[PDB]
From Swiss-Prot:
GO terms for molecular function: aspartic-type endopeptidase activity. It catalyses: Hydrolysis of proteins with specificity similar to that of pepsin A, prefers hydrophobic residues at P1 and P1', but does not cleave 14-Ala-|-Leu-15 in the B chain of insulin or Z-Glu-Tyr. Clots milk. This is Endothiapepsin. Residues 17-328 form the Peptidase A1 domain. Belongs to the peptidase A1 family. Keywords: Aspartyl protease, Disulfide bond, Hydrolase, Protease, Signal, Zymogen. Its EC number is 3.4.23.22. GO terms for biological process: proteolysis. It is an enzyme of class 3 (hydrolase). Disulfide bonds join 255-290. It comes from Cryphonectria parasitica. The chain holds residues 90 to 419 of 419 of the full protein. The active site is at residues 35, 199.
Length: 330
């Protein structure tokens, strides 16, 4: 089997991407944030505290004839961005672009943090990291990809995120028309539950490529590119007027600047992020200072190849017996 769904930026800055997901019988369609950095499928729901729902579409398990309460199961997750949610658990039928899993754990939110409430465009998350990170207690549950794997034509899913445009998540097959050149595959460590890999280095604009190992995660659920402070300083040093702003919380730059591209290595291959992908717009409405899309990972503990990086490539999440990651230019 296969599946294919269109993923769409939530706003004019590509702050995140949403993909429609059918849940229950009859189907309830919610727009979920597909997140290769976490492993819980959770949804706004009829059980969510009413003051914490502000425009999202909710899942109502009582209206799904295939929903079953998972007895005694709860979940609670806290994300790197400081947001959180928690609730109980149903199993139900979940379909993504024609690919169907029965018995998928659907984590129904009773509580969400303020940032989720304030974002009316994201109805929940669909985790695509490794199921070892799933938070359901006392019985950990499997991701949608983990449940679907055995039925897929190939045990893979691909992310093809657009810049200011729609893109695609495919399950079970590689669309060879969706990229140029070849896909370079690189090794993955699952020891922390992430699609963790090692980039072979970087270049800024037209500058010399620096060979240096950058260990980080392919994370469709993080907006920006978070890299070591040495690398990030070298990038922003090429932008006249850029500086690290403590009050804003990272590097900012004059909105009138034209940004250089940023290249990262995948083996001997190179992925070029165009400069405009690094512009995240005025720091506050009406400001002429703009927020940078490449930021220091120094306070994180891990480098994150977020949407800024991934949307420059066609990305293969290969769930073979030994998982690997594939990157192609597009």
């Amino acid at each position: 089997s296969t599946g294919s769904a269109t993923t769409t930026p939530i706003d004019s800055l590509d702050d995140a991407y949403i993909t429609p997901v059918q849940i229950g019988t009859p189907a309830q369609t919610l727009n979920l944030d597909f997140d290769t950095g976490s492993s819980d499928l959770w949804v706004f729901s009829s059980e969510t505290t009413a003051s914490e729902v502000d425009g999202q579409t909710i899942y109502t398990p009582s209206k799904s004839t295939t929903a079953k309460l998972l007895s005694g199961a709860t979940w609670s997750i806290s994300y790197g961005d400081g947001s959180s949610s928690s609730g109980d658990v149903y199993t139900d039928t979940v379909s993504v672009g024609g690919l169907t899993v029965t018995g998928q754990a659907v984590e129904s939110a009773k509580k969400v943090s303020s940032s989720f409430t304030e974002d009316s465009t994201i109805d929940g998350l669909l985790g695509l990291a490794f199921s070892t990170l799933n938070t359901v207690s006392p019985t950990q549950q499997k991701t949608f990809f983990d449940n679907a794997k055995a039925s897929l034509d190939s045990p893979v899913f691909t992310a093809d995120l657009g810049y200011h445009a729609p893109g695609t998540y495919n399950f079970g097959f590689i669309d060879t028309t969706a990229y140029t050149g070849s896909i370079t595959y690189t090794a993955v460590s699952t020891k922390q539950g992430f699609w963790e890999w090692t980039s072979t280095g970087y270049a800024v604009g037209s500058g010399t490529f620096k060979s240096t190992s950058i260990d980080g995660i392919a994370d469709t659920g993080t907006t920006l590119l978070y890299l070591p402070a040495t690398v990030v300083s070298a990038y922003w040093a090429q932008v006249s007027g850029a500086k690290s702003s403590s009050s804003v919380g990272g590097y900012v730059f004059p909105c009138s600047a034209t940004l250089p591209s940023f290249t990262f290595g995948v083996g001997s291959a190179r992925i070029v992020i165009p400069g405009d992908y690094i512009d995240f717009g005025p720091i506050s409405t009406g400001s002429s200072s703009c927020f940078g899309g490449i930021q220091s990972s120094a306070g994180i503990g891990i480098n994150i190849f977020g949407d800024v990086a991934l949307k420059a490539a066609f990305v293969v999440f290969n769930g073979a017996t030994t998982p690997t990651l594939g990157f192609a230019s597009k």
